[PDB]
Amino acid sequence: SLSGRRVLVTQADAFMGPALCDAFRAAGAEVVPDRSALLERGAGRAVIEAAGRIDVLVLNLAIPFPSTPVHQVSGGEWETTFAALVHPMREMVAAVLPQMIERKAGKILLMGSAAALRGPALGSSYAAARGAQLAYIQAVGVEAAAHGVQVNAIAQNFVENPTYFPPEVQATPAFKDRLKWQVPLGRLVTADEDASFAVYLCSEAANCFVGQVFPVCGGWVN
């Protein structure tokens, strides 16, 4: 039971935010659903500082999937991708660790992307940002293990959510075929399956997981 624990969930209305908030409420936690814009220097530090005590930080972060060929990407599209997905992650982790290290206890979970694990044919700058996320979480988890703090990542794809798999995507035949030929599960991971796994990864039972990346994508990548 995550009873009387404070769980902050970023971009709570987007990506996995809704399901995460529901799931952490049902487990009995005090959920702080942050909707702040995170693009500006210092914004992520501000979210953490405004919250006071954090027991669990769930980095739910997302942008629309860019469609740009790799040679026509601007330096600005690139730096926007990293300003949305990468720089806030670092600000928030660095702001929240000190209190978890002091308490010798705490949970950080990244809701990252399997596009860092299996290259896409059009999301080159998206894939780069998501890879920065995964490698950072790995390194921070190894660091923080020494202090009793667990930092881990989900690497997901083909999960039902409004940002990357809304119904309009699901109706396209390209998606139909991507499921047939690439997803052994043969269906989308439901938002609630994903969020229950997140809850497990933020429980004491999961104190043995430090710096680990868990793929959640119906067998699309293993």
The footprint of Cl ion on residues 160-179 (CB under 5 A) is 164
Q: What is the DSSP string of 148-205?
A: TEEEEEEEE-SB-BTTTB-HHHHHSHHHHHHHHHH-TTSSPBPHHHHHHHHHHHTSGG
For the chain, the residue count is 222
Strands 30-33, 149-156: pairing is unpaired
At closest approach, how far in Å is the CB of 211 from a second copy? 5
Binds 52, which of a second copy, Cl ion, none (CB < 5 to 8 A, cut-off by type)?
none
Site for a second copy contains 184 (CB under 8 A): yes
**9 part of the interface to a second copy, by CB under 8 A:** no
Judged by DSSP in three states, 213 sits in strand
Q: Is the dihedral of CA 90, 136, 118, 195 positive or negative?
A: negative
Q: Is 216 near a second copy (CB under 8 A)?
A: yes
Counting contacts by CB under 8 A, is residue 143 touching a second copy?
Answer: yes
Residue 16 or residue 29: which is nearer to Cl ion going by CB? 16
Asked if 62 interacts with Cl ion (CB under 5 A), we say no
Q: Which part of the chain contacts a second copy (CB under 8 A), choosing from 2-10, 26-34, 46-54, 188-196?
A: 188-196
Contact indicator for 28, 51 with CB cutoff of 8 Å: no
200 binds, options Cl ion, a second copy, none, Cβ within 5 to 8 A by partner type: a second copy
CB of 142 to a second copy, least distance (A): 4
Counting beta carbons within 10 angstroms of the beta carbon of residue 22, is it exposed (0 to 12), middle (13 to 18) or buried (19 or more)? middle
Measured from the CB atom, the residue of 13 and 77 that comes closer to a second copy is 77
SS3 label, residue 210: coil
**What residues make contact with Cl ion under the rule CB under 5 A?**
156-157, 159, 164
